[PDB]
Structures are given as C-alpha cells and as structure tokens.
Amino acid sequence: KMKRGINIGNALESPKDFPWDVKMSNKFFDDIKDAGFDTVRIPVRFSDYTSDDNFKIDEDFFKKIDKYVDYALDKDLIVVLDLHHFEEIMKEPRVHKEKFLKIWQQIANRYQKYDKKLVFELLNEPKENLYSQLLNEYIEEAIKIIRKTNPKRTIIVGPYNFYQIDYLNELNIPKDSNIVVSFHYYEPNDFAFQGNIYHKGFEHLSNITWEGTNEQMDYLKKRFDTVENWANKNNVKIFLGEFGVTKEAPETSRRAWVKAVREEAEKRNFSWAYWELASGFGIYNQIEGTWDRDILSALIE
Ligand SMILES: [Ca+2]
C-alpha cells in the first residue's frame, strides 16, 4: 500500500507558542492526492500540549488533529501520525518515559476505530540520551499499550541517532507482524542540508554539488545495501520516512540527488516519504498550490 509519500513538515511539529512557516490546510491533502502520492506523513509535537498530572493532550489541539486526519483519510490517503520533536525525552528519557506512554495511550484510544490507512509512528529520530537499550524498552511498552485497542494498526519504529542506518543493528524488532521499520537518509549531510536554518551547523554552507558520480552512486547503493540486508534478515518492510534537499542547493544536483535516492528506495521495495511539502525543503507552493515540476518529476514519473 505505502509507496509514494510526502511530509507536511514545519507545521504541527512546531513548538506550541512559536508556529513555523507552514500552516496546515486541508487543500494540501487534495493536492498531495492529485499529484500521485499515496501516503502523507504528519509530524505532530504532542509533547508540547500535555498536562505537565496524567499528561492529558490539549483537547482543543487534539480536535485539530482530528480535523486534518479525518480529511486526509477521507481522500483515501495513508496517514502516518508521527510523534515528532519530543525533545525532553531525548535529554532525560527516564524522567519522561511515563509521559511518552500516556501520550500514546490517548492516541491509541482516541483513534482505535479509525481506518487501517491511519498509521502510528512512535517517536521520530531518537537521539542523545535515549540510547538503544532504553529506546527498545520504551518501544516495547508503547506497542503493548497500543495493541490493547489497535491489535493490527501498522506501527512504525526507527533506530537510534536520528533514524540512522548505522544503528539498525541495535533496534530490537518487536515480535509483531504489523510493524514497519523506518530510516531517514540525508547523505551527504552538507549537500542535503546546505543553507537551512533549522539545521544546526549547516546554515552557512553554500553551492555544494551532487553530480551523481560513480563513487557518489556507489556510496548511496552501499548504504541502502546495509538496510536491505538488515531488513532481509529480520523480515520487515522498510519505510524511508524522510529524505530531501534544501531549496538553496544547486537545481540540477537537487533533482539528481532526489531522483537517485527515490529510485534506490523503490528498487529495493522501500516505501518512501519526501522530506517536506512547502518549507525550506519544499517542492510545493502553499500560496498558489503549484508543484515544482523539476523535483516532482524526480519523485513521481
Ligand atoms: Ca545530524
């Protein structure tokens, strides 16, 4: 089912009192669907909207999530609900374990009767102090809570260090048949992130090219070999949940990189979701509702 997706980034994963540059709109889902995408990933920073007692998600904000999820699902889109930018659990995971479990208890109970096309992604890009031994422990507990009401909804988990390929070997695959494993790919970092302010240490890079040389193509293929081999041994489908290039990158390289990465994902039966619809990595004009044909052609022929 899942194949061609796109992230609505820098939107609902913003901090609670500083919204970012993309305002979620139902028209997005109409244009996402009409462009040929079958999946939409929705980052949501639920952690910024909780009772800080039972960790009750702000009902007003939760009704907003109902708004967009319902609309997207009603357009026959696969919706990945993604717990994004849970920052404090990365700093002090043991202090925020319970808040993490209760957050997902509410999501699982509130959407238990929703269409199969709604997918749960537990925790985007674990990092810092939420290392694998703790990450695995929390994922197992969260999956057992969700399964009490959603025995069969697809659940997406990812490895430590920003969903990094190199940490798949530490990810414990749950003994659950409805679980997708996700990695993110932005290699090389300096090319993909160049000029983006939301990327610490990459805002001042300039004019870095990706020409698809033989060693550049060999590198990309070798990295995807690692994920496929790991996926083959553990019997799990792989979701390239994030990949993309900033708008500041040279046009030709940006298109070639996105084309090559998308092609590698499909060649190995990876589902994928382009990183970002209308922001600094965007390929879509939120004001006009028009697509960047150059990059869109790289994703969907
Ligand atoms: Ca990084």
Numbering used by the authors: 39 to 90, 92 to 340
Quote the study's own text.
Our subsequent analysis of the cognate glycosyl hydrolase, CcsZ, reveals the Clostridial cellulose synthase contains a functionally analogous, but structurally distinct, glycosyl hydrolase from the known Gram-negative cognate glycosyl hydrolase BcsZ. In agreement with typical GH-5 enzymes, CcsZ folds into an overall structure adopting a distorted TIM barrel fold, in which an (α/β)8 barrel is formed at the core of the fold by eight parallel β-strands. The GH-5 consensus catalytic acid/base and nucleophile residues are present in CcsZ as Glu-164 and Glu-281, respectively.
We engineered and synthesized the soluble domain of ccsZ from C. difficile, corresponding to residues 30–340 of the GenPept entry WP_077724661.1, into the pET21 expression vector to generate a recombinant His-tagged expression construct of CcsZ. Our CcsZ crystals grew in space group P 21 and diffracted X-rays well to 1.75 Å resolution with a single copy of CcsZ in the asymmetric unit. The model covers almost the entirety of the CcsZ construct, from residues 38 to 337 in the sequence, although residue Ser91 could not be reliably built into the model due to a lack of electron density. Interestingly, we observed this groove to be strongly negatively charged in CcsZ, which is not a typical feature of GH-5. Our structure of apo-CcsZ superimposed excellently on apo-TmCel5A, with a root mean square deviation (r.m.s.d.) of 0.677 Å across 252 equivalent Cα atoms, as expected given the reasonably high sequence identity (43%) between these proteins and the highly conserved GH-5 fold. The TmCel5A-cellotetraose complex also superimposed well over CcsZ, with an r.m.s.d. of 0.620 Å over 242 equivalent Cα atoms. A comparison of the substrate-binding cleft, informed by the positioning of the cellotetraose ligand of TmCel5A, demonstrated a clear difference between the subsite architectures of the two enzymes. The residues that contribute to the -1 and -2 subsites of TmCel5A appear to be partially conserved in CcsZ, present as H123, H124, N163, Y225 and N48.
